[PDB]
Amino acid sequence: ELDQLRQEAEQLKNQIRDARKACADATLSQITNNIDPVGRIQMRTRRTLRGHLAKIYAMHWGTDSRLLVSASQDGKLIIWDSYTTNKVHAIPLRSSWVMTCAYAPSGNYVACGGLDNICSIYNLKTREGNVRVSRELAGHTGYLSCCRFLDDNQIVTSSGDTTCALWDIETGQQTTTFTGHTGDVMSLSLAPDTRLFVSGACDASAKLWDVREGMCRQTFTGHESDINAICFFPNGNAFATGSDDATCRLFDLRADQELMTYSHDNIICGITSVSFSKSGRLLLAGYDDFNCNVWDALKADRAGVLAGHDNRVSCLGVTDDGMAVATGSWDSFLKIWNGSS
Amino acid sequence: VQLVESGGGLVQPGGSRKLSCSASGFAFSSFGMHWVRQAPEKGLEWVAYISSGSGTIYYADTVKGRFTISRDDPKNTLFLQMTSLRSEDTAMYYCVRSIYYYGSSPFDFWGQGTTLTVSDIVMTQATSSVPVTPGESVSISCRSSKSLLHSNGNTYLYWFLQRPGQSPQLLIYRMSNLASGVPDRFSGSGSGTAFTLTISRLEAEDVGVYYCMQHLEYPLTFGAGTKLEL
Amino acid sequence: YSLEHXRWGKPV
Amino acid sequence: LEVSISDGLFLSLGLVSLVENALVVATIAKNRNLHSPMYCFICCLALSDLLVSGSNVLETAVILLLEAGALVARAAVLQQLDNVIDVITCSSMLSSLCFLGAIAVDRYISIFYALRYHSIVTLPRARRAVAAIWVASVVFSTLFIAYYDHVAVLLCLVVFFLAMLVLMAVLYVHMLARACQHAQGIARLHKLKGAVTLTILLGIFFLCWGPFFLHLTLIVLCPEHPTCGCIFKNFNLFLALIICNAIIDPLIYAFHSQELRRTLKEVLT
Amino acid sequence: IAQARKLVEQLKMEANIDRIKVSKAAADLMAYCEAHAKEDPLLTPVPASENPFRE
Amino acid sequence: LSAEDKAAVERSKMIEKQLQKDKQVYRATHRLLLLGADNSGKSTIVKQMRITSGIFETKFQVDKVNFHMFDVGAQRDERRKWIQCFNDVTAIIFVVDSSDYNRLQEALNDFKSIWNNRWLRTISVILFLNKQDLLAEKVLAGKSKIEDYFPEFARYTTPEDATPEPGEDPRVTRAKYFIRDEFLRISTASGDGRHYCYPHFTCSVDTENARRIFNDCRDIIQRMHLRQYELL
Ligand SMILES: [Ca+2]
């Protein structure tokens, strides 16, 4: 009967907690207590991109690290050349309320979706020269919150329907549905190997999914509110998570638990987006407060702040070359930052 | 994609003729458009350019006072109103689309051409012809009087192949970058001042005249072309 | 000559 | 009666004012939510108040240097210096007074054409109106300072002030009629501040600008009556009140904005 | 009920997964940071001549 | 700049021209969020105004003012994340099935949830107490009565400024304005006056509802600008 299963659930949760406490021999704060402080990272807005018309909800970098997709409530995707600030493409969306976009590792495609509960795959490199919808992925039964390409033909796609799905773009069908979540899946990050991904949800949990085996490899539950944001550490064996509670937390896959919690009492508002730098040494977190703070990911102290935005910083991204962090906000502007010594 | 040029035939010297080109199946308004002409035995020569939205218009000095290029985007039709035509304007005139954004391949599609009979950086291709065999790993040299490596890092040498009964076709846009449709049997390399196309295994579809072209600055000159003879 | 603050500060 | 406004007071008020209005302009420049026709007109008002305060400052500095003799200069070069600083002052007055009207008109359209507001008022049209105001205002202020001995100039100034008065009156009292109608609807659903706000807007308007145009009216209509002589002796009080406009209008129009105040905090940090 | 049997099986899986100690995890992240520090332009700002956004 | 950079900046300028045109479209368009449970008949309101997809954009126009009304639907039963998008809509329209008393309580709690939400603290709610005909019919039949569900309807008696329709019975007036007052108590409770609730009684036979929403948005924007001007 049900009571036996609910009890064995409690027992197995206790077993998991005991194994984690057994592994918790030392904190990251202790092991990194003697590593050098990174010091103040006075990043500067090298470019402001001014073309969007409403609240920007998402951006994603190309692997080329200069092209930059950006989605806004206006129902546009703009492809930006970050270097020149040029608008490479402006894509009229079939729905205004886009909430995620992705740029394919090839840059042949950009994905976006939102309250349409549909991801439109847009072919950037048509012979007809206009950008057009390559596929219109449907099967999600709720809003579409994040998507990331694995390949020109595969996209992983989280939804408020509490599921993530892997899609075969050439056939428009879900090749795997990930269904252990119990709340709106808000955030999604592919491992650099693309064989694993983490997805964070409003059940305050992050889950690690095997893309091809199809099952929850393990589950992370340290947060107190909705995990708005998630990002793998570039080693691919830890990931950061940003919540409605003002903390972000770094979970190690192999230690199966929080290494570190990034929080400061001056910060009382939700984290909106999270990205690591190429070394993983910086964790960059966007906030409801219009700042995005830079954290020492090892020591957990506020190495800096990017303060130029006039509204909620909705999305962060570091280039794959690491040369810059882009930052979109609800003020419709998209700022690219680096220091220059 | 089907650029189809119309007009042409004979004219008397001093005459006037309006060439046109219907764009058919592509987003014509978003492309810049070029006219390029080929004299009956000679290499390509850029004629005119009109941007998307007609903002930029540029001409070669051989036509600058004489030809006017215009476009009707609602009709998806390009025009070249020629005036004061002269014997040196006798050519096949190719309409050539171009699109300019990071990573774009301009000059990627060429129309069938219309023949008209009237009754700068220098690109040097010192090989007027090379005799070649199937499977041979032939290379085509090109040289420039100005370094085509711009401070933005691009090296603006394009390579075109005109097969004996066809329009030109883009092979390489920046000196490294192969066009989206073309065999990787082709490759390009260069120093900004001197350049090679390479064809690691020839086949009969590679027979033709190979034109290098600079897109560093207008007037956008082509080379004399290297013929490959099988 | 006199230079005064503003203008029209005194009649005629 | 004579309120003997010192040159030190013109310097103090004009410096304070150009400081404050420059803060207003920096705060609008830095915050792109304030790149909107409302705050465009508020920025142009702050610029006109900056230019008027700075022109009074520059004129006060020149006259202090002449009173000290730290500058010695011929009559002609000082007459033309006076002409130039007076043109900057008069143009920035006419422009400030126009931008007070333009803010009133923008606010009025934002209420009574609320749904069509962003069709009727746009940054294109805002920048056109701003340019026409400054350009027309340099035209007019040059004509006024060239023909300053002609009473038609003083009457044009007074009549312009009165047209702005009857305008802003019609306007803000219609906005207050609709405010009362809203207050009634609120009262009906739910089961004074507008009057206070109009008393501050139109009172600081009339009580700071109006002394100067009353002065011009008496210079035309009453050049020689001793009570008009008493008013003429207070002309420095009247310019210092116009600088009190340049002080208070930031407070009335700009720093009522919460997003401006937030940007002002980050500009001052 | 099938959903609770699935939840039990999933917790059984999470229980059975192998884990390394947090000290080794922390050491591996710190080592990755140290081994990639100079390769990170946001951590260690590249010269202004070298920066892709200046000069 | 290279010739290709010159052409790419030309392209960016041309896209900026198009984005400026869309800025004209987008600021002339007023966005509305059409909330309400499945009983509310909000789909009938959509249909009568127009004469697995997660959102439906109902475009309509009154006196040359364009309105886009987003009937969000096929979403999951937690709204608390996607309502963050509709910050900076001109209004939320919240259709209530006035007839469905047992679901009227969850409609009230859902109204409280919208009104109190930190992201909606400034977004006015146009209540459409729909199916007012079915409500009239139910009350005139008398088989089950508000008193079975809300005993305060003994204490409550008609407002002194209620304005019944000429054929409207006073007990229908009592039910109408009690439901209204129930919502207004929440609104007048938590509202700082940043945002207000505009209840309108309506039925399927209303052609007027476009005019209603036009007037309500006009009042919302007027109150908003007057609050900004400290005139209200
Ligand atoms: Ca003077």
mmCIF file with all atom_site columns, C-alpha atoms in Angstrom, chain B residues 67-139:
data_model
loop_
_atom_site.group_PDB
_atom_site.id
_atom_site.type_symbol
_atom_site.label_atom_id
_atom_site.label_alt_id
_atom_site.label_comp_id
_atom_site.label_asym_id
_atom_site.label_entity_id
_atom_site.label_seq_id
_atom_site.pdbx_PDB_ins_code
_atom_site.Cartn_x
_atom_site.Cartn_y
_atom_site.Cartn_z
_atom_site.occupancy
_atom_site.B_iso_or_equiv
_atom_site.pdbx_formal_charge
_atom_site.auth_seq_id
_atom_site.auth_comp_id
_atom_site.auth_asym_id
_atom_site.auth_atom_id
_atom_site.pdbx_PDB_model_num
ATOM 1  C CA . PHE B 1 67  ? 24.708 53.617 -66.438 1.00 0.00 ? 67  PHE B CA 1
ATOM 2  C CA . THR B 1 68  ? 22.184 53.915 -63.630 1.00 0.00 ? 68  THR B CA 1
ATOM 3  C CA . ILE B 1 69  ? 21.251 50.895 -61.514 1.00 0.00 ? 69  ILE B CA 1
ATOM 4  C CA . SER B 1 70  ? 17.850 50.795 -59.807 1.00 0.00 ? 70  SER B CA 1
ATOM 5  C CA . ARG B 1 71  ? 15.573 48.228 -58.224 1.00 0.00 ? 71  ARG B CA 1
ATOM 6  C CA . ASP B 1 72  ? 11.848 47.626 -57.738 1.00 0.00 ? 72  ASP B CA 1
ATOM 7  C CA . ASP B 1 73  ? 11.741 45.434 -54.628 1.00 0.00 ? 73  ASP B CA 1
ATOM 8  C CA . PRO B 1 74  ? 7.927  45.060 -54.752 1.00 0.00 ? 74  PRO B CA 1
ATOM 9  C CA . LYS B 1 75  ? 8.402  43.595 -58.210 1.00 0.00 ? 75  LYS B CA 1
ATOM 10 C CA . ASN B 1 76  ? 11.591 41.768 -57.098 1.00 0.00 ? 76  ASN B CA 1
ATOM 11 C CA . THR B 1 77  ? 13.235 43.182 -60.229 1.00 0.00 ? 77  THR B CA 1
ATOM 12 C CA . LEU B 1 78  ? 16.636 44.786 -60.685 1.00 0.00 ? 78  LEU B CA 1
ATOM 13 C CA . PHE B 1 79  ? 17.323 47.286 -63.450 1.00 0.00 ? 79  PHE B CA 1
ATOM 14 C CA . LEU B 1 80  ? 20.376 48.678 -65.218 1.00 0.00 ? 80  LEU B CA 1
ATOM 15 C CA . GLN B 1 81  ? 19.429 51.663 -67.427 1.00 0.00 ? 81  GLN B CA 1
ATOM 16 C CA . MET B 1 82  ? 22.354 51.989 -69.830 1.00 0.00 ? 82  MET B CA 1
ATOM 17 C CA . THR B 1 83  ? 22.881 55.237 -71.763 1.00 0.00 ? 83  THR B CA 1
ATOM 18 C CA . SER B 1 84  ? 25.456 56.445 -74.318 1.00 0.00 ? 84  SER B CA 1
ATOM 19 C CA . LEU B 1 85  ? 26.393 52.836 -75.034 1.00 0.00 ? 85  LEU B CA 1
ATOM 20 C CA . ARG B 1 86  ? 29.762 52.210 -76.658 1.00 0.00 ? 86  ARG B CA 1
ATOM 21 C CA . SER B 1 87  ? 31.658 49.288 -78.161 1.00 0.00 ? 87  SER B CA 1
ATOM 22 C CA . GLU B 1 88  ? 33.507 48.611 -74.907 1.00 0.00 ? 88  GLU B CA 1
ATOM 23 C CA . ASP B 1 89  ? 30.111 47.884 -73.291 1.00 0.00 ? 89  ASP B CA 1
ATOM 24 C CA . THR B 1 90  ? 29.590 44.798 -75.486 1.00 0.00 ? 90  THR B CA 1
ATOM 25 C CA . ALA B 1 91  ? 29.421 41.968 -72.953 1.00 0.00 ? 91  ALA B CA 1
ATOM 26 C CA . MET B 1 92  ? 27.337 39.322 -71.328 1.00 0.00 ? 92  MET B CA 1
ATOM 27 C CA . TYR B 1 93  ? 25.890 41.114 -68.282 1.00 0.00 ? 93  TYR B CA 1
ATOM 28 C CA . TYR B 1 94  ? 25.454 38.957 -65.173 1.00 0.00 ? 94  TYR B CA 1
ATOM 29 C CA . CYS B 1 95  ? 23.166 39.974 -62.339 1.00 0.00 ? 95  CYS B CA 1
ATOM 30 C CA . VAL B 1 96  ? 24.767 38.940 -59.046 1.00 0.00 ? 96  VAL B CA 1
ATOM 31 C CA . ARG B 1 97  ? 23.067 39.000 -55.662 1.00 0.00 ? 97  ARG B CA 1
ATOM 32 C CA . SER B 1 98  ? 24.998 39.821 -52.528 1.00 0.00 ? 98  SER B CA 1
ATOM 33 C CA . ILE B 1 99  ? 24.165 39.883 -48.828 1.00 0.00 ? 99  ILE B CA 1
ATOM 34 C CA . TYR B 1 100 ? 26.436 41.460 -46.199 1.00 0.00 ? 100 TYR B CA 1
ATOM 35 C CA . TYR B 1 101 ? 26.552 40.426 -42.532 1.00 0.00 ? 101 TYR B CA 1
ATOM 36 C CA . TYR B 1 102 ? 29.141 38.581 -40.463 1.00 0.00 ? 102 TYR B CA 1
ATOM 37 C CA . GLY B 1 103 ? 29.714 35.205 -42.127 1.00 0.00 ? 103 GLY B CA 1
ATOM 38 C CA . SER B 1 104 ? 27.620 36.043 -45.169 1.00 0.00 ? 104 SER B CA 1
ATOM 39 C CA . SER B 1 105 ? 28.681 34.776 -48.593 1.00 0.00 ? 105 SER B CA 1
ATOM 40 C CA . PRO B 1 106 ? 28.108 37.681 -51.023 1.00 0.00 ? 106 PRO B CA 1
ATOM 41 C CA . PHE B 1 107 ? 28.192 37.080 -54.777 1.00 0.00 ? 107 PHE B CA 1
ATOM 42 C CA . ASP B 1 108 ? 26.897 33.594 -53.949 1.00 0.00 ? 108 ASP B CA 1
ATOM 43 C CA . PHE B 1 109 ? 24.398 33.438 -56.830 1.00 0.00 ? 109 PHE B CA 1
ATOM 44 C CA . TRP B 1 110 ? 24.774 34.671 -60.427 1.00 0.00 ? 110 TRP B CA 1
ATOM 45 C CA . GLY B 1 111 ? 22.023 34.979 -63.034 1.00 0.00 ? 111 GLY B CA 1
ATOM 46 C CA . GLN B 1 112 ? 22.086 33.295 -66.424 1.00 0.00 ? 112 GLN B CA 1
ATOM 47 C CA . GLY B 1 113 ? 23.287 36.576 -68.045 1.00 0.00 ? 113 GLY B CA 1
ATOM 48 C CA . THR B 1 114 ? 21.998 38.705 -70.909 1.00 0.00 ? 114 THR B CA 1
ATOM 49 C CA . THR B 1 115 ? 24.238 39.426 -73.912 1.00 0.00 ? 115 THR B CA 1
ATOM 50 C CA . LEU B 1 116 ? 24.403 43.053 -75.129 1.00 0.00 ? 116 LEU B CA 1
ATOM 51 C CA . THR B 1 117 ? 26.013 43.806 -78.500 1.00 0.00 ? 117 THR B CA 1
ATOM 52 C CA . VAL B 1 118 ? 26.968 47.387 -79.345 1.00 0.00 ? 118 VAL B CA 1
ATOM 53 C CA . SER B 1 119 ? 27.483 47.310 -83.104 1.00 0.00 ? 119 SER B CA 1
ATOM 54 C CA . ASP B 1 120 ? 42.022 50.538 -58.378 1.00 0.00 ? 120 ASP B CA 1
ATOM 55 C CA . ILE B 1 121 ? 43.360 47.329 -56.913 1.00 0.00 ? 121 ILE B CA 1
ATOM 56 C CA . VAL B 1 122 ? 44.629 45.134 -59.756 1.00 0.00 ? 122 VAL B CA 1
ATOM 57 C CA . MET B 1 123 ? 44.063 41.373 -59.492 1.00 0.00 ? 123 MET B CA 1
ATOM 58 C CA . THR B 1 124 ? 46.846 39.554 -61.357 1.00 0.00 ? 124 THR B CA 1
ATOM 59 C CA . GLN B 1 125 ? 46.358 35.924 -62.423 1.00 0.00 ? 125 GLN B CA 1
ATOM 60 C CA . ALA B 1 126 ? 49.563 35.369 -64.366 1.00 0.00 ? 126 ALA B CA 1
ATOM 61 C CA . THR B 1 127 ? 48.373 31.928 -65.541 1.00 0.00 ? 127 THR B CA 1
ATOM 62 C CA . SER B 1 128 ? 46.069 32.637 -68.449 1.00 0.00 ? 128 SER B CA 1
ATOM 63 C CA . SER B 1 129 ? 45.624 28.866 -68.624 1.00 0.00 ? 129 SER B CA 1
ATOM 64 C CA . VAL B 1 130 ? 46.817 25.653 -66.979 1.00 0.00 ? 130 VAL B CA 1
ATOM 65 C CA . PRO B 1 131 ? 46.617 22.195 -68.581 1.00 0.00 ? 131 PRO B CA 1
ATOM 66 C CA . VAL B 1 132 ? 45.281 19.681 -66.041 1.00 0.00 ? 132 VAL B CA 1
ATOM 67 C CA . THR B 1 133 ? 44.197 16.042 -65.627 1.00 0.00 ? 133 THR B CA 1
ATOM 68 C CA . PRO B 1 134 ? 41.432 14.384 -63.595 1.00 0.00 ? 134 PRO B CA 1
ATOM 69 C CA . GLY B 1 135 ? 42.485 13.693 -59.998 1.00 0.00 ? 135 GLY B CA 1
ATOM 70 C CA . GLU B 1 136 ? 45.378 16.170 -60.190 1.00 0.00 ? 136 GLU B CA 1
ATOM 71 C CA . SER B 1 137 ? 45.852 18.476 -57.210 1.00 0.00 ? 137 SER B CA 1
ATOM 72 C CA . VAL B 1 138 ? 45.989 21.770 -59.126 1.00 0.00 ? 138 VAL B CA 1
ATOM 73 C CA . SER B 1 139 ? 46.385 25.240 -57.585 1.00 0.00 ? 139 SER B CA 1
#
